[PDB]
Structure 1
Amino acid sequence: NSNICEVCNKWGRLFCCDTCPRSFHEHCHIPSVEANKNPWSCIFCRIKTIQERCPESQSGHQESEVLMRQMLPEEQLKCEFLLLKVYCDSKSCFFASEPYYNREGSQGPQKPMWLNKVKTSLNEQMYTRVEGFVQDMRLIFHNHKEFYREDKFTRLGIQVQDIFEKNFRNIFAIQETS
């Protein structure tokens, strides 16, 4: 197995996947690494299994159809993995914890949002459809773009949104377009 966490790329107290060489900190993995379970399979392995059990799940889909899916166990897992893929990028640090807004010439967002809040919301089964999760994720970056206006820091929002959207299209097998 790897000797660094797959998500944050640091050593420490790592839990190792039994079916692939990835390792994780307890709370870097999503869901948090399960207490018992020997063997244990990580989220990457669990997603690969879904795909292997239903190869047709990789044919293209319309985003509108994906968004209306109810959060049954497989869609719950897919959203957890997509959230994890965003945390895998180091620039996710800027969006993880609860933000505050005091900048001359800008007003804070009406509905603040951040990664750890989405993480809690998934953990507590607060989303009933994929749309709920995707909306909160997109709102993180939209809030950031609006607040930082012409400051070059706005680019961080664009960058992390691009990681989110690329992973969304991959995980949910959105039909490729120009």
Structure 2
Amino acid sequence: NSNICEVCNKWGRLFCCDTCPRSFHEHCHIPSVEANKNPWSCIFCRIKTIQERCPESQSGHQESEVLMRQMLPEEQLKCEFLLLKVYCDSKSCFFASEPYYNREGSQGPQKPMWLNKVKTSLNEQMYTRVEGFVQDMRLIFHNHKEFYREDKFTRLGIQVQDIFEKNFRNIFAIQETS
């Protein structure tokens, strides 16, 4: 196994996947690494299994259909993985914890949002459809763009949104377009 966490790239108390060489901090993995379970398979492995069991799950889909899907176990897993892929980028630090807004010439968002809140929401089964999760993810970046206006820091929102959107299209097998 790797000697660093796959998500944050640090050493520490790591839990090792039994079916691949990745390792994780307990609360870096999503869901948090399970108490018992020998062998244990990480989220990467669990997502690969879904694909292998249903190869046709990789044919192209329309985003509108994906969003309306109910959060059954497989869609719950896919959203957990997509959230984890965002955390894997170091620029996610900016969006992880609860933000506050006090900048001359701007007003804070009406509905603040952040990664750890989405994380808790998934853990608590608060989303009934994929759309719920995706709307909250996109709101994080949209809030950021609006608040920071012409400051160059706005680009951090663009950057992390692009990681989200690429991973969304991959994980949910969105039909490729120009």
- TM-score range, shorter-chain basis? over 0.9
TM-score by length of 2: 1.00
Give 1:148 shift: 0.1
Give 1:58 shift: 0.1
Give 1:160 shift: 0.0
**1:122-166 deviations in whole A, cap 9, x for unaligned?**
000000000000000000000000000000000000000000000
**1:9-62 deviations in whole A, cap 9, x for unaligned?**
000000000000000000000000000000000000000000000000000000
Give 1:77 shift: 0.0
> In structure 2, how many angstroms separate the alpha carbons of the residues matched to 1:76 and 1:68?
13
For the residue of structure 2 that corresponds to 1:24, the secondary structure is strand
> In structure 2, how many angstroms separate the alpha carbons of the residues matched to 1:60 and 1:110?
35
Unaligned runs of at least 5 residues, structure 2: none
Unaligned runs of at least 5 residues, structure 1: none
Give 1:64 shift: 0.0
> In structure 2, how many angstroms separate the alpha carbons of the residues matched to 1:173 and 1:106?
38
CA RMSD of aligned residues (A): 0.1
Give 1:96 shift: 0.0
**Map of 1:144 onto structure 2:** 144
For the residue of structure 2 that corresponds to 1:15, the secondary structure is strand
For the residue of structure 1 that corresponds to 2:24, the secondary structure is strand
Aligned length: 178
**Map of 1:131 onto structure 2:** 131
> In structure 1, how many angstroms separate the alpha carbons of the residues matched to 2:157 and 2:9?
22
Within-5 A mapping of 1:14-163: 14-163=14-163
Give 1:103 shift: 0.0
Following TM superposition, the consecutive aligned residue runs of length 4 or more in structure 1 with deviations greater than 3 angstroms are none
